[PDB]
Coordinates of C-alpha atoms and ligand atoms in Angstrom, one line a residue:
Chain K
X1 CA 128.6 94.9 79.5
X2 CA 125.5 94.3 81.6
X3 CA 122.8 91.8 80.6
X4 CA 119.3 92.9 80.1
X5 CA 116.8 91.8 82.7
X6 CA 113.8 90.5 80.5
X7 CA 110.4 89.6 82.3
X8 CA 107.3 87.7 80.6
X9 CA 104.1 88.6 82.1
X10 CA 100.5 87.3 80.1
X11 CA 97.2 85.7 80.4
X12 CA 96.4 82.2 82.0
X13 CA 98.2 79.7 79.6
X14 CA 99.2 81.9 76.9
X15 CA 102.5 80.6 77.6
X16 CA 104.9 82.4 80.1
X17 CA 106.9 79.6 81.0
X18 CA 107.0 77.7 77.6
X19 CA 108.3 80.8 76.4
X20 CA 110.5 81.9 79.0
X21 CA 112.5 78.3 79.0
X22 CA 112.5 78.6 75.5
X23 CA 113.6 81.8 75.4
X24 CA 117.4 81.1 77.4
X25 CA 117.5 77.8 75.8
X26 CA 117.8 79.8 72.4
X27 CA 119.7 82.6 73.9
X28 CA 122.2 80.5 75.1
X29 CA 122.2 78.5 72.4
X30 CA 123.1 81.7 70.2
X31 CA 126.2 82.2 72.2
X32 CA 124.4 84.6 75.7
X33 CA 124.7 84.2 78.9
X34 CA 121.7 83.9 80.1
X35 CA 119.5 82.2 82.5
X36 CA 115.7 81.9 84.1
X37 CA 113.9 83.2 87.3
X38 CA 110.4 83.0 87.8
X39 CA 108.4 84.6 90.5
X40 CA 107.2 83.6 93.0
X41 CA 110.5 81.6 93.6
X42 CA 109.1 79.1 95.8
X43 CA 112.1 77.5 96.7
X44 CA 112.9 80.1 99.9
X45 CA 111.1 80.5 103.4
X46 CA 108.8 82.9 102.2
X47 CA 108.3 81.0 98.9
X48 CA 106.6 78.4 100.5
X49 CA 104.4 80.0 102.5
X50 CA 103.4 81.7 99.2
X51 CA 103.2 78.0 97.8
X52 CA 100.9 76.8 100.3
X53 CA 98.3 79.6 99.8
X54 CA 98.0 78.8 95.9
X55 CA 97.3 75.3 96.3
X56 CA 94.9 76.3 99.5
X57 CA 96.8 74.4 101.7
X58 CA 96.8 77.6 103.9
X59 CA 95.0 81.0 104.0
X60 CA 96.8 84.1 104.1
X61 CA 95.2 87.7 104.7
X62 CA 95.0 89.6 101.7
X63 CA 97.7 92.5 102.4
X64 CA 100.0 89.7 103.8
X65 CA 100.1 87.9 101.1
X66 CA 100.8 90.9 98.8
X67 CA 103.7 92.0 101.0
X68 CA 105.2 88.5 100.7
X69 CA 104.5 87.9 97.3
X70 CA 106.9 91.3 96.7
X71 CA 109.5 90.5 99.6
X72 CA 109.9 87.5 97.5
X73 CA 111.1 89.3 94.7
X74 CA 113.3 91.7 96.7
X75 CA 115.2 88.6 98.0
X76 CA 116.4 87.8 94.8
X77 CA 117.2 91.6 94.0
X78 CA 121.1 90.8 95.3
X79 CA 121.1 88.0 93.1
X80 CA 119.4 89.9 90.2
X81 CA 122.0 92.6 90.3
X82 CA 125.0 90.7 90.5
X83 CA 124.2 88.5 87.9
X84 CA 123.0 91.3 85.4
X85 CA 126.6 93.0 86.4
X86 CA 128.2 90.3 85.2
X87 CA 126.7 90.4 82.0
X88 CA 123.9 87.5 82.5
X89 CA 120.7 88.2 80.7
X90 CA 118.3 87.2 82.8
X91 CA 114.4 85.8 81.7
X92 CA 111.6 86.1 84.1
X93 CA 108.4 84.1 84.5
X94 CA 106.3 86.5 86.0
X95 CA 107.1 89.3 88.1
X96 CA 106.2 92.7 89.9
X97 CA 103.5 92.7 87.4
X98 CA 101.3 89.8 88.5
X99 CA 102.1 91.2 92.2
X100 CA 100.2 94.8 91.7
X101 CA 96.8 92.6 88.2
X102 CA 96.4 89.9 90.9
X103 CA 96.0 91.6 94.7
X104 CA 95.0 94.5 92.2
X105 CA 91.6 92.2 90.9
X106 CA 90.7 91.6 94.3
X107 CA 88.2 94.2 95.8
X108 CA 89.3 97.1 97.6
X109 CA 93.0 97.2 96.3
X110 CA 93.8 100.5 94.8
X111 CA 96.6 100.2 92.2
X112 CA 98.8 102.9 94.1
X113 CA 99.0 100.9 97.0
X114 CA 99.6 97.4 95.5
X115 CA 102.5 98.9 93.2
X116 CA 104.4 100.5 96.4
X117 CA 106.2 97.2 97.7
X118 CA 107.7 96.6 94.4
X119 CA 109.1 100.5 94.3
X120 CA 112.7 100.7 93.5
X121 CA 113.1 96.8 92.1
X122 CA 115.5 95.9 89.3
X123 CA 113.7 98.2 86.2
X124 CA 112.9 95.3 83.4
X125 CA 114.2 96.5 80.0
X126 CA 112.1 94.4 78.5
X127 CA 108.4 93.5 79.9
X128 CA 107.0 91.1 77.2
X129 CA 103.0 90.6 77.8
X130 CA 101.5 87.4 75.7
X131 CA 98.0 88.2 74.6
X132 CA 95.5 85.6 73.7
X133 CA 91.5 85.6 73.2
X134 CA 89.9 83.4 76.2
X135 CA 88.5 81.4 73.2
X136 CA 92.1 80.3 72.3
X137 CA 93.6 79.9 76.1
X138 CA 90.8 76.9 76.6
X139 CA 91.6 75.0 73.8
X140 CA 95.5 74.9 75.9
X141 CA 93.2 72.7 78.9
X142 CA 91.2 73.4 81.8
X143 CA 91.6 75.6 84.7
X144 CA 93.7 74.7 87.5
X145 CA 93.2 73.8 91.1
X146 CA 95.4 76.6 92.4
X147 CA 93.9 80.0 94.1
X148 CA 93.2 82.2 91.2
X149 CA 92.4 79.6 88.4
X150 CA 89.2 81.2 87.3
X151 CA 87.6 83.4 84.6
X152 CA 85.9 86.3 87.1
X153 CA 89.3 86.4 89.4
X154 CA 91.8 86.5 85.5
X155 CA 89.4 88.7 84.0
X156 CA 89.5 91.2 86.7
X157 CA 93.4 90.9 86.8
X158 CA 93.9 91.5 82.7
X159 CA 91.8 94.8 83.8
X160 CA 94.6 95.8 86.2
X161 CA 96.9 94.7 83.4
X162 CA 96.4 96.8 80.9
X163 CA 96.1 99.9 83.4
X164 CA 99.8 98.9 84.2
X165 CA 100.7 99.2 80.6
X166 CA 99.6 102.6 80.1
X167 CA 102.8 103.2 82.2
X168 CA 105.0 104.5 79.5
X169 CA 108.3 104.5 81.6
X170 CA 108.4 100.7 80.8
X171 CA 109.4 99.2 77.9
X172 CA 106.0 96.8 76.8
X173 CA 106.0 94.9 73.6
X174 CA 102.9 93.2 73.3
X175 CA 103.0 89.5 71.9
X176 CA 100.7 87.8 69.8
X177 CA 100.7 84.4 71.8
X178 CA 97.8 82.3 69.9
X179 CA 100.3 81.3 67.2
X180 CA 102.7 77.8 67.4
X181 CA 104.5 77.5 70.3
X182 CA 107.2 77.6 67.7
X183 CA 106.4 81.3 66.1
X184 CA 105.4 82.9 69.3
X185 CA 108.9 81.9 70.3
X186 CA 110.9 83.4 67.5
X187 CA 109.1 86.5 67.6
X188 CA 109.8 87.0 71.6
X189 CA 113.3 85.4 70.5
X190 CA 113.5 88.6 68.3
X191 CA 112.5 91.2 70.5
X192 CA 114.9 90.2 73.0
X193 CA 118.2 89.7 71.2
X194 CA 117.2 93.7 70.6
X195 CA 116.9 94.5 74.1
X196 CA 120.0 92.8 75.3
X197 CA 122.2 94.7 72.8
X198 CA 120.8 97.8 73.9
X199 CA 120.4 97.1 78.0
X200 CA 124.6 97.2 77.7
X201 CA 123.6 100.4 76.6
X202 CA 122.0 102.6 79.9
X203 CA 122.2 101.6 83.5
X204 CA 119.9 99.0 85.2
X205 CA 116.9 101.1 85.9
X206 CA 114.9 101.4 89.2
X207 CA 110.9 100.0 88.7
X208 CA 108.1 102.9 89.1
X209 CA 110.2 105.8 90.2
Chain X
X1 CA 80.9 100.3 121.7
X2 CA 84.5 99.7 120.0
X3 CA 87.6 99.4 122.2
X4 CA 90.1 101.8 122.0
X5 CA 93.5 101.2 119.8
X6 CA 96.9 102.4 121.7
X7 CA 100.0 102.0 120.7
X8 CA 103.4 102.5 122.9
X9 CA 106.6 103.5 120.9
X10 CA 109.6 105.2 122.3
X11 CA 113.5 104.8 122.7
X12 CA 115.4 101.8 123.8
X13 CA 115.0 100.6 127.4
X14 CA 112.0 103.9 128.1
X15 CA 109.8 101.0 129.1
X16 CA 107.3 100.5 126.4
X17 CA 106.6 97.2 127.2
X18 CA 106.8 96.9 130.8
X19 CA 104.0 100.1 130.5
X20 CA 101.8 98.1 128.1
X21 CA 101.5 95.4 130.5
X22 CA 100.8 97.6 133.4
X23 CA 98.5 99.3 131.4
X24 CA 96.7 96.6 130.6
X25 CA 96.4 95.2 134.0
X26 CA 95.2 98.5 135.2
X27 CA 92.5 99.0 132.6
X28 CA 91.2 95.4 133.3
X29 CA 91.4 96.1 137.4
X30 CA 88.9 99.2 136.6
X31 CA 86.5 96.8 134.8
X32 CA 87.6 97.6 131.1
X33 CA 88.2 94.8 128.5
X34 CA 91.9 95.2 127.2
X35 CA 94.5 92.8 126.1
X36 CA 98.1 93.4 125.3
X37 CA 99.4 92.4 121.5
X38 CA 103.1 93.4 120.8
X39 CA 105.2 93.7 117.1
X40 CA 106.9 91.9 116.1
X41 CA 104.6 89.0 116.9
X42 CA 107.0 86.0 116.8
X43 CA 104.9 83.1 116.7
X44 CA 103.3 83.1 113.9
X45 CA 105.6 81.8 110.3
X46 CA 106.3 85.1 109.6
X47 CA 106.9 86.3 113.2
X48 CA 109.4 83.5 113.4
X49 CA 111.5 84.6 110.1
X50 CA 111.4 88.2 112.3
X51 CA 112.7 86.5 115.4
X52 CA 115.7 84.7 113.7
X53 CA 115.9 87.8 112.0
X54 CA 116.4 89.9 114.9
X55 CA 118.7 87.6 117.4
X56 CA 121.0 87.5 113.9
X57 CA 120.5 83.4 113.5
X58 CA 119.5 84.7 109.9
X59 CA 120.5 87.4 107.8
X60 CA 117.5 88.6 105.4
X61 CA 117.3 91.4 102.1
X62 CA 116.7 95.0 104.4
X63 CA 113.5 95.4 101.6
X64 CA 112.3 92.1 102.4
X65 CA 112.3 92.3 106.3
X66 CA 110.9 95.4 105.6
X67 CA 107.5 94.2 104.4
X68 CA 107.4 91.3 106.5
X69 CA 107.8 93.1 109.5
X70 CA 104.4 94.9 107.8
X71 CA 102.6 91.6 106.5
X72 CA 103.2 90.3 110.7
X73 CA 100.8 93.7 111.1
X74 CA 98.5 92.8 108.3
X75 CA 98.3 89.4 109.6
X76 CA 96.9 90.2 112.9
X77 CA 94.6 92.9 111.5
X78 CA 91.4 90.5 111.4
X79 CA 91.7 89.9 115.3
X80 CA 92.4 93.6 116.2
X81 CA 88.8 94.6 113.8
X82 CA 87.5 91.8 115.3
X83 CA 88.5 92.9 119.2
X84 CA 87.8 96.2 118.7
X85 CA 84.2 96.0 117.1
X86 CA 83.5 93.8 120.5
X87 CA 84.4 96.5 122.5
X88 CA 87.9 95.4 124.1
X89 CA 90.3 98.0 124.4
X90 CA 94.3 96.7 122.4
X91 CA 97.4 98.0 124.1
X92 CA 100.1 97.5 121.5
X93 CA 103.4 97.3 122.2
X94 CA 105.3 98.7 118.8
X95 CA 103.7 99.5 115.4
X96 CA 103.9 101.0 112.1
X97 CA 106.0 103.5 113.5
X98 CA 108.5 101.0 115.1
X99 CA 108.6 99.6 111.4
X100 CA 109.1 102.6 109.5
X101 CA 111.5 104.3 112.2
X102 CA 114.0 101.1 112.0
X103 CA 114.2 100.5 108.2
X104 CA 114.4 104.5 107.7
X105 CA 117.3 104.8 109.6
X106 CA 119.1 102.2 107.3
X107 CA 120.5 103.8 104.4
X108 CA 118.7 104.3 100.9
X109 CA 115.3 104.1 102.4
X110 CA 113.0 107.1 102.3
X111 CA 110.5 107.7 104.8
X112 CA 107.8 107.7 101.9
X113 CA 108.4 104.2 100.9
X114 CA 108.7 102.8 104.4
X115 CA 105.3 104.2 105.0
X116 CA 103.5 102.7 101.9
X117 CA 103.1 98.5 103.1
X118 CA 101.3 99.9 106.4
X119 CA 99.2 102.7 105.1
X120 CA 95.5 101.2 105.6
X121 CA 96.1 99.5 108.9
X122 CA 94.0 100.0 111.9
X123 CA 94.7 104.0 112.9
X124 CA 95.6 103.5 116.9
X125 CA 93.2 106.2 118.9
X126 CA 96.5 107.3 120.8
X127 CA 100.1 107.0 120.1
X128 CA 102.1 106.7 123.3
X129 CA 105.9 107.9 122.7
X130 CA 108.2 107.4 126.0
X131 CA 111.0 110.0 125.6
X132 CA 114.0 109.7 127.9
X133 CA 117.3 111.0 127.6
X134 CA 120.0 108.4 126.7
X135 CA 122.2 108.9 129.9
X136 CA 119.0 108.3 132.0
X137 CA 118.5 104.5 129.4
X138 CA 122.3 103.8 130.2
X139 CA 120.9 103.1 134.0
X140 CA 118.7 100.2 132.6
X141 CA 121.2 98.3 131.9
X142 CA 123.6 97.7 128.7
X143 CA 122.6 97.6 125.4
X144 CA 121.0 94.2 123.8
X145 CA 122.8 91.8 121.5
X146 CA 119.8 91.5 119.3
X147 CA 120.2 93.4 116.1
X148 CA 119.6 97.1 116.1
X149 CA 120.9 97.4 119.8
X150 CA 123.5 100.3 119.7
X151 CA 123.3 104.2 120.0
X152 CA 124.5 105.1 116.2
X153 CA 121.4 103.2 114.7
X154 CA 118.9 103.9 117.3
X155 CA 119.6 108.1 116.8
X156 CA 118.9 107.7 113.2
X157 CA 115.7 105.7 114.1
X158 CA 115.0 108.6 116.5
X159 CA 115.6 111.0 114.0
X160 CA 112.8 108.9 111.4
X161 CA 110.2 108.8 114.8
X162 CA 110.3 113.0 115.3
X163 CA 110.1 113.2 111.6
X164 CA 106.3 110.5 111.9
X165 CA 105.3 112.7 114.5
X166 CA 104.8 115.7 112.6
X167 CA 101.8 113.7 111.0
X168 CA 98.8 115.7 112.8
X169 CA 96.5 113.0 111.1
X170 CA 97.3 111.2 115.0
X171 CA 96.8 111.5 118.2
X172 CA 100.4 111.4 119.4
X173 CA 101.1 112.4 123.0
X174 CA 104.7 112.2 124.5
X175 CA 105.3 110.7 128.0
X176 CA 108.1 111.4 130.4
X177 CA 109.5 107.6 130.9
X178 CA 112.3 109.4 133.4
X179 CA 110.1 108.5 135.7
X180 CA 109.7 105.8 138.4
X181 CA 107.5 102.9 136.7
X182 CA 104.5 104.0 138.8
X183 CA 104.5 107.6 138.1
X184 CA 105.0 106.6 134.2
X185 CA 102.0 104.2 134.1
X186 CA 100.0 106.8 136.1
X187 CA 100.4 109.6 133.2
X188 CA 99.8 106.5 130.6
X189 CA 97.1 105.2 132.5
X190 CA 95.1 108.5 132.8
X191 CA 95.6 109.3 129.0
X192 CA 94.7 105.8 128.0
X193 CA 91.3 106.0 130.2
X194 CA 90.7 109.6 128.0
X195 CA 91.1 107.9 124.9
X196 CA 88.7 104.5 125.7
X197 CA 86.1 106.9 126.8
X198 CA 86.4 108.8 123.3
X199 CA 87.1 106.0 121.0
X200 CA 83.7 104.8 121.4
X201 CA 82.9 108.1 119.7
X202 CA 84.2 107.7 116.2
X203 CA 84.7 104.8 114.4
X204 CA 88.4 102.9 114.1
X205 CA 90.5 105.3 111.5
X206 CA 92.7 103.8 108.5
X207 CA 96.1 104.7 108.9
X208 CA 98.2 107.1 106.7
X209 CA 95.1 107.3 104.7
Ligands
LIG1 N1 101.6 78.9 71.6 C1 101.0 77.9 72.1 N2 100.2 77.1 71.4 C2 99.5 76.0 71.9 N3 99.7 75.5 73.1 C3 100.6 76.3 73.8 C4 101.3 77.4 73.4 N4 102.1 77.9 74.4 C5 101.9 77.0 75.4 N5 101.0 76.0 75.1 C6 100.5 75.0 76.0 O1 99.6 75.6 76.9 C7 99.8 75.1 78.2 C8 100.1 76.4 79.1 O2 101.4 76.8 78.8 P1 102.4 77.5 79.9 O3 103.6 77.9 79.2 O4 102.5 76.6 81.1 O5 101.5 78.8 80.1 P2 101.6 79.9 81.4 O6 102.9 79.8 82.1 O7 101.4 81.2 80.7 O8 100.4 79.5 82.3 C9 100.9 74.1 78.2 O9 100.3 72.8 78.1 C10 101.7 74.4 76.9 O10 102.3 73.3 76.3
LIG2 N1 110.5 104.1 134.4 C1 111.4 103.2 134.6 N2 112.4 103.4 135.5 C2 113.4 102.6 135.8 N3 113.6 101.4 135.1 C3 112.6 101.2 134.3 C4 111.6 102.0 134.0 N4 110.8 101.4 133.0 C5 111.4 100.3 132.7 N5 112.5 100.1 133.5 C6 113.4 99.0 133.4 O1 114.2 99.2 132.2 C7 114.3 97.9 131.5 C8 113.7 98.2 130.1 O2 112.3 98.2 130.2 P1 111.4 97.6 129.1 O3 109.9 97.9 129.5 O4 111.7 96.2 128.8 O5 111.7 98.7 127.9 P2 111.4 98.7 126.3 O6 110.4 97.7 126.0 O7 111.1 100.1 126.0 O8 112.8 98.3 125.7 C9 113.7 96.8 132.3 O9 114.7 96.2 133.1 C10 112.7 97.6 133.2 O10 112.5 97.0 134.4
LIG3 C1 104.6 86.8 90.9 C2 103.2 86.8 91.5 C3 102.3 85.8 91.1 N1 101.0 85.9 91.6 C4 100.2 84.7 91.2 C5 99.8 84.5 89.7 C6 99.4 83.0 89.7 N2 98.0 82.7 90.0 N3 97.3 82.7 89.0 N4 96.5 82.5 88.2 C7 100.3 82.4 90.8 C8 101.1 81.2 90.2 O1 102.0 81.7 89.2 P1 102.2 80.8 87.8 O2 100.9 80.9 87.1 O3 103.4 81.6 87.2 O4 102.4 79.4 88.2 O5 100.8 83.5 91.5 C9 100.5 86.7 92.6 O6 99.4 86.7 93.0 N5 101.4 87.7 93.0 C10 102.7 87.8 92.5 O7 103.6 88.7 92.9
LIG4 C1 107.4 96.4 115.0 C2 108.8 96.5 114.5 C3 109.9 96.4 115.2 N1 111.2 96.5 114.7 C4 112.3 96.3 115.6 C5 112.5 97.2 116.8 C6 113.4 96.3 117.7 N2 114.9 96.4 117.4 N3 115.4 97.3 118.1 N4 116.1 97.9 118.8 C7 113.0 94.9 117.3 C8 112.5 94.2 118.6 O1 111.4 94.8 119.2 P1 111.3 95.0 120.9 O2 112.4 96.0 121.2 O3 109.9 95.5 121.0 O4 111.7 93.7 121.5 O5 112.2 95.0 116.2 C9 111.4 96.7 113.3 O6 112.6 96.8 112.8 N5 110.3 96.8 112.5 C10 109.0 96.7 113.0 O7 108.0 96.8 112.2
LIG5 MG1 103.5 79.2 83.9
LIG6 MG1 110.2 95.9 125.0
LIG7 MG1 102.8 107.6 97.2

């Protein structure tokens, strides 16, 4: 009985990884296996180069980033697929998503071509995306130092956001993140004790084919 | 005046790169600007993942060497605009080809998605492909122990090359590397002179695109 692959994609702060550590906390806690990636994993080789260019400790050209920023996820993919086989839920902060909204908000980056790395990954059965009015998200702090901490640059990846979402193969449940930390959880809680009943359900599917 | 874009491919042992550097020497002896570049490039980070890679020191997800065999392309992409636009002529030793030809003859990979990380690069002006027959590469000595080196994978890379040359968007044009070196770098020389003298013609193409 496979577990369900579960990724949490969302605006700047609305709560991602709160949510997502919350999320296996309470799904282990209810008697699942289950545990949490996030992406980029920054642990590996290519992880850290990918860490260096957010804080602008490096510069990395544009299409080289986005290929490393998806090979990063691919390295996990053995990983991914064994542990889902063996009937581990897995959460996951971020993921193919955030590869195509953020190369995607920069300018001449069609959508085709910044979704084509990512063909063929682990198919989420659950892609959870936390919505919250910029109003709300700056009352949660400031900006941060990294590469892509601003308004213009996160306004121009919601855009490629919600072009993703018109994709109908995936299975998007939008969440209402401007409540408690508390609420928002139990609703996400919710939707995904669904999802892993059913994931035993089909095969692992393949992302955007 | 832009500089002209050539790329050598062909089999194992034809003599791709000792033609690119005799082509290069020959171009600058007749008072043109060219300098050799070569892929994999192995010193930059992600030239050195490709290196350990390649000599087997490191074993790495066939998606993920995939793309950053691509992002090493992307990363040099800056300097060959930049080279070009000043009017020096790039003999490149390997390509986009080279990297869709070797993951395409793995299994699982179409040639479609193999493609997709290098479609935008710098189009080359002419693609060089040095055909010889496999008894005629036995004579160059035994096989490599880098990975790759053996006759069942490099006839299903030779299969993926024939099947990139039926792309009429390039300027392919096949050389007889059966040859002595001199009378191989004569025919490369004369059709690289062609090209230069046409390149300046029509501005640098986007590949696959
Ligand atoms: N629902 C919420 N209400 C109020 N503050 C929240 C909520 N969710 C997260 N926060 C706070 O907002 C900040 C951003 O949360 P975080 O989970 O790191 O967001 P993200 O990973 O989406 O950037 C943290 O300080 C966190 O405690
Ligand atoms: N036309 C040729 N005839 C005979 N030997 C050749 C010829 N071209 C190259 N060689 C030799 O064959 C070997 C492979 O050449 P190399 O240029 O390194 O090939 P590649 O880069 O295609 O693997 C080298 O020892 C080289 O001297
Ligand atoms: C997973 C992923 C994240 N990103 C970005 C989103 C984030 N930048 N912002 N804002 C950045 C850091 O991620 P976190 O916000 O999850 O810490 O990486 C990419 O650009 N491509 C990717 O493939
Ligand atoms: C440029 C490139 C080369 N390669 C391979 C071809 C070669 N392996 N063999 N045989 C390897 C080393 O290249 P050279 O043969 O040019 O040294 O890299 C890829 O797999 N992908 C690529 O994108
Ligand atoms: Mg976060
Ligand atoms: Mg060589
Ligand atoms: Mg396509």
């Amino acid at each position: 009985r496979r577990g369900a692959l579960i990724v949490l994609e969302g605006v700047d702060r609305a709560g991602k990884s709160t949510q997502s550590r919350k999320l296996v906390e309470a799904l282990c806690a209810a008697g699942h296996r289950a545990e949490l990636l996030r992406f980029p994993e920054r642990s590996t080789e290519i992880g850290k180069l990918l860490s260096s260019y957010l804080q602008k400790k490096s510069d990395v050209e544009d299409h080289s980033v986005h290929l490393l920023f998806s090979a990063n996820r691919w390295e996990q993919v053995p990983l991914i697929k064994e542990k889902l086989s063996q009937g581990v839920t897995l959460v996951v902060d971020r993921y193919a998503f955030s590869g195509v909204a953020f190369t995607g908000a920069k300018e001449n980056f069609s959508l085709d071509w910044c979704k084509q790395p990512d063909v063929g990954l682990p198919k989420p059965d659950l892609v959870l995306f936390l919505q919250l009015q910029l109003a709300d998200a700056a009352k949660r702090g400031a900006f941060g130092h990294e590469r892509y901490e601003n308004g213009a640059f996160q306004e121009r990846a919601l855009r490629c956001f919600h072009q993703l979402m018109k994709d109908t193969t995936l299975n998007w449940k939008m969440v209402d993140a401007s409540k408690s930390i508390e609420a928002v959880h139990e609703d996400i809680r919710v939707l995904s004790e669904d999802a892993i009943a059913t994931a035993t359900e089909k095969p692992l599917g393949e992302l955007w084919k």
